[PDB]
């Protein structure tokens, strides 16, 4: 029997939303966003990873676009490549794609693996958030109620569970005799509840939200 409701917020384990602008780059805030959480519990440190550092160094080899898209399956894999990622503020977004400037000295952050969880699984979504911690997923974003979200447990009768925007699922709950995901979005602090939008759970893999799930992990060593 998993808990009611999961926030890792209440952990420390989330760093503040980010505002990724008009770059595209949602696929690469989810991804440091994910492993930010494993690096807080294994360190007890919590400090924001570089997005830059994946918009410009994972790119071709690892089918990322930077700011036309990517994936946060291979941003990790280059994180294990790189045997690294920078922090953010030793290098910082800029909202463009840059050359690659990864510096090992100012790295903040390993990456040792990475687990792709099976398609439309909430149930299985469910339970790597409660006991694996945040997990990377894509949502189908392109629908205008998306954009002017509020507040709310949002549900949009047209959405598809083909994605296109990369989110960070922190958490999940029941409230108001709905059930929810906590989801970090990338659109700053002026976005939804205070930068988060929470979006149907339990509603037949709405906008796609189990589609395609992954998380990394850092392991002793
Ligand atoms: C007409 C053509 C043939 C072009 O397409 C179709 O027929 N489609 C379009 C695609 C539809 C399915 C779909 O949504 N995805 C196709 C499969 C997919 C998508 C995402 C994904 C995750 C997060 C984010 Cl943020 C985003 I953005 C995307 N992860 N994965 C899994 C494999 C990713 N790869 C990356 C490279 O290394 C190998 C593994 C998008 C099905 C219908």
Known sequence: I?????????????????????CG????????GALEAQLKLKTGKLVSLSAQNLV??????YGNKGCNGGFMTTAFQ????????????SYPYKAMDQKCQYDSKYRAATCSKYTELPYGREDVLKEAVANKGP?????????????????????????????????????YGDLNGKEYWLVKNSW????????????????????????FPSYPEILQG
């Not at 410009?56 to 080899?61: P, R």
């Not at 280059?78 to 922090?87: A, M, P, Q, T, V």
């Not at 149907?200 to 709405?206: L, P």
């Open 78 to 89: 280059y994180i294990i490549d790189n045997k690294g990622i920078d922090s953010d503020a």
């Open 135 to 171: 997990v990377s997923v894509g949502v189908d974003a392109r629908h205008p109620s998306f954009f002017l979200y509020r507040s709310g447990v949002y549900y949009e009768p047209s959405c598809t569970q083909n994605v296109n925007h990369g989110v960070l699922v922190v958490g």
């Open 188 to 211: 700053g602090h002026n976005f939804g509840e205070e930068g988060y939008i929470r979006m149907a759970r339990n509603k037949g893999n709405h906008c796609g939200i189990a589609s």
């Open 56 to 61: 410009d160094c994972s790119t071709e080899k």
């Open 25 to 32: 780059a949602s696929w690469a805030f989810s991804a440091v």
């Open 2 to 22: 998993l808990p009611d409701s999961v926030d890792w917020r209440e952990k420390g384990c989330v760093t503040e939303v980010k505002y990724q602008g008009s």
